[PDB]
Amino acid sequence: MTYKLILNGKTHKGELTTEAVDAATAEKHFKQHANDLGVDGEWTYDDATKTFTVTE
Amino acid sequence: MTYKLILNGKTHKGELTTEAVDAATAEKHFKQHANDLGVDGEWTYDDATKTFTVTE
Ligand SMILES: [Cl-]
Ligand SMILES: [Cl-]
Ligand SMILES: [Cl-]
Ligand SMILES: [Cl-]
Ligand SMILES: [Cl-]
Ligand SMILES: [Cl-]
Ligand SMILES: [Zn+2]
Ligand SMILES: [Zn+2]
Ligand SMILES: [Zn+2]
Ligand SMILES: [Zn+2]
């Protein structure tokens, strides 16, 4: 399924999508990108919309 | 000004924004993120909308 990451960082905002066979696969993928983009915040997940948010 | 990066990659799609004092500052910032997200493609820039696109 297609998962989305919403980044609400102080220096980086936006949205990334990726295809993953399960939610853990997508979340590990996304935690790597949030690290890469310097966004260290609070994580939430919405299963209905397959959307992770990271908020600084 | 706020610049945007549109990523149209095979494995990563989405949009990132950042504030930068000039376009070269934003583009260097964004080229680092596209590298980080594994998106190596053709770059275009639209000055009217301060938008870089990278397309695989
Ligand atoms: Cl799917
Ligand atoms: Cl950004
Ligand atoms: Cl950055
Ligand atoms: Cl500004
Ligand atoms: Cl992605
Ligand atoms: Cl990735
Ligand atoms: Zn799928
Ligand atoms: Zn950034
Ligand atoms: Zn500005
Ligand atoms: Zn990705």
CB count within 10 Å of CB A17 equals 19
- Residue B7 structure tokens: 């990523």
Closest to B53 in 3D by CA, of B2, B16, B12, B7: B7
Residue contact B15–A14, C-beta within 8 A: yes
Token pair for residue B15?
A: 């949009």
Residue B53 belongs to domain with CATH number: 3.10.20.10
Which residues pair with residue A42 across a beta bridge? A55
Q: Which stretches of chain B are assigned E, i.e. beta strand?
A: 2-8, 13-19, 42-46, 51-55
- Terminal Cα-to-Cα distance of chain B (whole angstroms): 26
Q: Which H/E stretch holds residue A3?
A: strand A2-8
Could you give the maximum distance between any two Cα atoms of chain A, in Å?
31
By Cβ distance, the residue of B11, B14, B36 closest to A14 is B14
Look at chain A and report how many structural domains it folds into. Answer: 1
Please name every residue paired with A7 in a beta bridge, in sequence order, or none if there are none: A14, A54
> CA B17 to CA A45: how far, in whole Å?
22
Report every protein residue that has its C-beta within 5 angstroms of ion ligand 2. A 12; B 16, 18
Domain range holding A20?
A: 1-56
Resolution at which this structure was determined, Å:
1.5
Distance CA A54, CA A35 (A): 11
Strand partners, A3: A18
